[PDB]
Structure formats: C-alpha cells, structure tokens
C-alpha cells in the first residue's frame, strides 16, 4: 500500500516560502520588536510603523495562511510531538522521584530497616552461648562415657581399645 496522499503543499506552501520571506527586507525596515511597550508609555505606538512587519507577519497569517490550507492541519502536528520533553523530563522528575529520592533513600534506608532488633545481636550470641555450651555438653557426655566403658568391656580386644583411649586423650585434650 503506497498510500498516495494529496495535501496542499508546494503550491500553497510556496506562498509561505516566498511571501513570508519578505521579512528579509520588510521586517528589518519597520523594526517592530524590542519591546511591546510603545503606547504603554503613550508615545509612538507604530513605531514606525509595523505595516511591513505586518506584511511579513500577515504574510505568516495569510500568505502562510493560504499556505496553511492543509498545513493548519499539519503545522499543527508537534502539539503531540514537541511535548516529548514533557513526556520524559517529568518522567525524569518521576525518575527523580525514583532515583534522587526512592533509590537513594530506599537503598540506604530500606536497607537499614531490618537492623538491630536483630536482635540476633542478642540472639545469635544467645544461640552461640547455647551452641558452644551444648558442645561442651556432648563432649563432656563423651569423655565421661569413655574411660568407664573402654576399660570395662574392652579388657580382651586390645588395640581396639587403643582407639578409645586415643579418643579420651582428644576429648580431654
């Protein structure tokens, strides 16, 4: 599908190209700028005289208005495309919500939330002061069981009891 489109350009838009280009001589002659405070001081109000600047200005209103035959539909297009800085920078302000605020503060703060109240800083010690204690339970369960058994029932099978007395030497070591 080629989609052959017939706008109003290169015959309409040539009046914007040539007659609004009178501003090279017309707008530089009347010099209708710098500032809009002529008859606020009530002095001149022309000044003088914004007719050739209205020949270029009205050449933008009419000669680029007859050029705006189908181009006042189509100048008329970046109202949803020159707001690309409005779709992003506020999104960058949302990103500044996310990064200048939420990444740094959720980072170091939502990091630092689960803190002491662990707690573990007590309880892992209380685990340790259980655990090693329970270790010295079972090791002292071992050695106190060892020499009473080894000398008793391993009377006969010597050099199997050498293992047992070695383990008592470790457990009391």
């Amino acid at each position: 599908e080629t989609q052959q489109s017939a706008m109003n350009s290169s015959l309409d838009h040539l009046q914007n190209d040539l007659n609004r280009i009178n501003l090279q001589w017309n707008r530089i002659l009347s010099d209708n700028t710098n500032p809009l405070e002529l008859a606020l001081a009530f002095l001149d109000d022309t000044s003088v005289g914004l007719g050739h600047r209205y020949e270029e200005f009205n050449q933008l209103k009419s000669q680029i208005g007859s050029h705006l035959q189908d181009v006042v539909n189509e100048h008329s297009q970046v109202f949803n495309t020159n707001v690309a800085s409005y779709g992003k920078a506020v999104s960058s302000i949302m990103q500044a919500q996310e990064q200048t605020l939420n990444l740094k503060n959720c980072l170091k703060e939502a990091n630092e939330k689960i803190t002491t109240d662990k707690g573990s800083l007590q309880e892992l010690n209380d685990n340790n002061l259980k655990y090693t204690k329970m270790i010295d339970v079972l090791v002292n369960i071992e050695e106190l069981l060892q020499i009473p058994e080894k000398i008793e029932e391993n009377i006969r099978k010597e050099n199997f009891h050498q293992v047992q007395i070695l383990l008592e030497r470790g457990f009391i070591l």
């Binding site: 599908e1 080629t2 989609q3 052959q4 489109s5 017939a6 706008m7 109003n8 309409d12 933008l60 209103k61 009419s62 680029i64 208005g65 007859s66 705006l68 035959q69 189908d70 181009v71 006042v72 539909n73 100048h75 008329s76 297009q77 970046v78 109202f79 949803n80 495309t81 020159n82 707001v83 690309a84 800085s85 409005y86 920078a89 506020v90 960058s92 302000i93 990064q99 990444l103 740094k104 980072l107």
Partner: protein, 267 residues
C-alpha cells in the same frame, strides 16, 4: 504545588489537555476523524492506529492505498478548504502551532540528554546514573552481598547437601558398611552378596544413568575395587593354602565372578 513544580501544572494543564484531546475529534459529532473504529475512540490525543483507524472505508490488506489514501486526500482537501481559515487564515494560532511545535522543540534540544543545552542542569550528563553510579553504589552492595548473597547460596547449598545425603542412605554409605562387612565373615556372603544386591539396586542408580555423578561413580567404583579385593582374596585363599569346604570356596569364586564379571560384563 502547581506553581511551579513542573508536574501538578503539567497534570492539570497538560492532562486536562489530554481529555481535551480525547474529545477533540471524537466528540466532534461523532468521531469525525474516523468511521467508528472505536466507540471510546482511543485515543485522539494521538493516532492510536490500531484503535482509531477508520478515516475512510479501506482499511484492508492492501487497499490502504485505495481509501485511506483517499482519506488523506479527502480530509486533506476538505481540511485544505476548511482548515485554510479554521486556524489557517488566522495563523497567529498557527504561528503558535509552530512556536510550541518547533521552538519548544528547539528548547527540547536544550531539554534533551543533553546536548548543547547549557550544560549545567545536571541530568545531563548521566541519564543512566542509577547504573553509572548506583550500580557502582550497588557494586558497594556487591561488596555487601559478596559476603551476604554468597552466604545465602552456600547456606542453601549446604542445606541442600543435607537433603542430598538425606536422599542417599544405603548408597553414599555402604563403603564402610560393605568394607567392614568384607573381611568380617564371608562377607556373610550376603554382606557382600545381598549387600551388593540391594546395593546393586543403587549401583544401578549409578547405572540406569551416570552423567555425570562422579560421586555415585566413586561409590560403585569403590564397590568394584572392594569386590575385586574379596575376589583375589578368595582365589588366593582357595588356590594357595586350599583348606576349607572346597565346594564352598568354588561357590565363592563362582558367584563372586558371576556378579563381578556381570558388572564388568556391563562395562
């Protein structure tokens, strides 16, 4: 906080403008930009050419050059006439439809990333600063989890290893069980025979597939070497001194060679 703060005035003005786009050609009695491609007319603040796409009849597999092109020339002709003075001949609103269309975009080269903006609005130049410095601050967090995440993976790795030896009881043992059984009696013979029968179950865990369980391969490897040790012990005994029930020792070399070269026969 809409003066100025860039968001509440953009939400109020620019997003009250969004519903003004949603009811511009849609509420123009009635979706006059299209021919009812969508009742809600998504979106009409932009094209949304999958939703509102009915500016003329076709709209077909190739006939978008037929009538959608004739929609372009049709409403570009009717809008070439009506838009010549709708905002056309009064083109101060078209000088402003080029001012906030191009000169605001000329300020969007100054509201870009970056380029020749000022450039001392500091955005500009790290747009991936959360990757440029906060993946570097998150690389200080990689120094953090360098301890902690590795602790989590070795943690659940060790718990999964407890699951793994929990998932292997007769096998991954039976090195010292059949090994201590071996020199003990005969090994019963069942403490070699039935022990490597019910272990030949899980030695066929190590044989119904092996890839690449060098753990389980080491298991049935030491099963093999131990079985060879009782083999050469058996024929060493029954050969050299030769003093037992001779039929029993030949039954030992017989059955032990049967299983031994049965698994070597599988090899």
């Amino acid at each position: 906080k809409e003066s100025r703060a860039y968001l509440n005035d953009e939400s109020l003005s620019y997003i009250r403008d969004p519903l003004n786009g949603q009811e511009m050609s849609k509420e123009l009695q009635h979706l006059p930009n299209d021919s009812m491609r969508l009742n809600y007319l998504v979106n009409s603040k932009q094209f949304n050419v999958k939703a509102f796409l009915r500016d003329m009849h076709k709209q077909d597999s190739f006939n978008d050059l037929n009538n959608s092109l004739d929609r372009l020339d049709s409403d570009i002709q009717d809008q070439s006439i009506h838009l010549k003075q709708l905002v056309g001949k009064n083109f101060t609103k078209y000088v402003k439809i080029k001012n906030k269309l191009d000169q605001i975009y000329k300020e969007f080269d100054e509201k870009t990333n970056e380029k020749n903006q000022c450039d001392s609005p500091k955005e500009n130049q790290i747009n991936v600063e959360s990757l440029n410095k906060k993946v570097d601050e998150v690389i200080r967090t990689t120094t953090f989890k360098l301890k902690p995440l590795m602790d989590n993976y070795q943690k659940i790795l060790n718990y999964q290893a407890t699951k793994k030896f929990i998932e292997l009881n007769k096998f991954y043992f039976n090195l010292p069980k059949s090994l201590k059984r071996c020199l003990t009696n005969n090994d019963f013979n069942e403490f070699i025979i039935e022990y490597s029968k019910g272990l030949t179950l899980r030695r066929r865990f190590n044989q119904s597939s092996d890839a690449s369980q060098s753990l389980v391969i080491k298991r049935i490897w030491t099963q093999i070497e131990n079985l060879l040790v009782t083999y050469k012990d058996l024929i060493w005994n029954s050969l050299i001194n030769s003093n037992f029930n001779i039929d029993q020792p030949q039954e030992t070399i017989l059955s032990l060679f049967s299983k031994l070269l049965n698994l070597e026969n599988f090899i």
